[PDB]
Amino acid sequence: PDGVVSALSLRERIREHLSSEESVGLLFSGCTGINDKTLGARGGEVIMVTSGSGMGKSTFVRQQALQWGTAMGKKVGLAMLEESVEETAEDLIGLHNRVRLRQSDSLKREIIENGKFDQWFDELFGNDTFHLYDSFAEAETDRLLAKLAYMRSGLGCDVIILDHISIVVSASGESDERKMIDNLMTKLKGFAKSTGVVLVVICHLKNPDKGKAHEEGRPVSITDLRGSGALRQLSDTIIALERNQQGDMPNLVLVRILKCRFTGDTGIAGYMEYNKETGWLEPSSYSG
């Protein structure tokens, strides 16, 4: 039974490896430092981003999809399960154009009439780099995976953003969905590793209800992550955002690398500030 290769006979294979074997790919936008401790997002890697409900996850991720899909011309696949395509389409446009397009009826009215809409649409979806999952109607694990599968190998997406991994909708008849979040994870990491696609997954936090928490600051710990630490093991990197909406600097958010397989370099990456005007998470200078 021989499948036992001696290191000597791997010379070429290894050489072929070192050349065009990327260790730095897809850098995050909005806070160098995330990049310092992670060296970006490698293909085949599963990237986890979390935070207190409504503190940065969504915006942050949505911004990465934007930069990757624009300035760096990558094919971005979007799977925003809790919202409609036009809705997320709307967010991107406003965001790209640094305007709270949704939070303003006046503006939506304007651009549609003065014609700026069409301008903005082509200026963003012009190079056909964005592709989304359409439905809203509960997607099943394999059902979903099949579609992400299509996005990767079919439309050739470089990145897939799955927003919210609690919306499972699968094989109902097996206690505690904990097993679900885990099996799903396994299928995601497996899907990622083999296709080589960068996979950014969002998940929520357990409600600590034992101290003072999240919405009020309080660092998020690897244990806090929803779903029984199956993702704490299946995901290669873990970005967490922390901020105190009920404090002094509600828009000051701290980025913490809870985990990073590739580099092993963990800890506080840096900070960012939410600009209510532009609706962006701008880079910041701070230290507490």
- Residues in contact with Mg ion by the rule CB under 5 A: 58
**What sign has the CA pseudo-torsion 57, 284, 281, 47?**
negative
154 binds ligand ANP (CB under 6 A): no
172 labelled as ligand-binding? Answer: no
Q: What span, in angstroms and rounded, lies between the C-alpha atoms of 257 and 26?
A: 17
32 binds, among Mg ion, a copy of itself, ligand ANP, none (CB under 5 to 8 A by kind): none
Q: Is 51 annotated as a binding residue?
A: yes
- 260 DSSP β-pair partners: 237
**From the CB of 170, what's the least distance to a copy of itself, in Å?**
11
Is 196 annotated as contributing to ligand binding? no
| List 56, 77, 94, 227, residue binding ligand ANP (CB under 6 A) | 56
**Cα 221 from Cα 285, distance rounded (Å):** 23
Other CB atoms within a 10 A radius of the CB of residue 150 amount to: 14
- Tell me if 56 is assigned to a ligand binding site: yes
* 55 lines the binding site for ligand ANP (CB under 6 A): yes
Residue 264 interacts with ligand ANP (CB under 6 A)?
A: yes
- Single out the residue of 42, 16, 93 nearest to residue 196, CA to CA: 42
For 49, the enclosing helix (H) or strand (E) is: strand 46-51
User: 187 contacts which partner out of ligand ANP, a copy of itself, Mg ion, none, CB within 5 to 8 A by kind?
Assistant: none
The CA dihedral of 161, 167, 173, 174, to the nearest 10 degrees, is 70
Is 52 part of any known ligand binding site? yes
| 280 part of the interface to ligand ANP, by CB under 6 A | no
Q: Which does 96 bind (CB under 5 to 8 A by kind): a copy of itself, ligand ANP, Mg ion, none?
A: none
* CA distance readout (Å), 193 to 56, 122, 172, 196: 27, 33, 27, 5
Our CB check for ligand ANP shows the closer of 85 and 149 to be 85
Q: Are the C-beta atoms of 189 and 231 separated by less than 8 Å?
A: no
CA 152 – CA 283 distance, rounded (Å): 31
Encode burial over 79-104: b for 16+ CB neighbours within 10 A, e otherwise.
bbbebeeeebbebbbbbbbebebeee
Site size toward ligand ANP (CB under 6 A) is: 17
Interaction of residue 243 with ligand ANP, rule CB under 6 A:
yes
User: Which of Mg ion, a copy of itself, ligand ANP, none does residue 15 bind (CB under 5 to 8 Å by kind)?
Assistant: a copy of itself
Question: Is the CB of 111 or the CB of 202 nearer to ligand ANP?
Answer: 202
Asked if 226 and 204 touch (Cβ cutoff 8 Å), the reply is yes
* Angle (CA) 98 55 193, round 5°: 90
Residue 253's binding partner out of a copy of itself, ligand ANP, Mg ion, none, with CB under 5 to 8 Å set by partner kind: ligand ANP
Only one of the segments 10-18, 52-60, 63-71, 144-152 lies at the binding site for ligand ANP (rule: CB under 6 A); that segment is 52-60
Q: Does 193 bind ligand ANP (CB under 6 A)?
A: no
When binding is defined by CB under 6 A, the residue of 88, 132, 279, 284 that contacts ligand ANP is 279
> Which residues of the shown chain bind ligand ANP in the complex (CB under 6 A)?
53-59, 82, 243, 250-251, 253, 261, 263-264, 274, 279
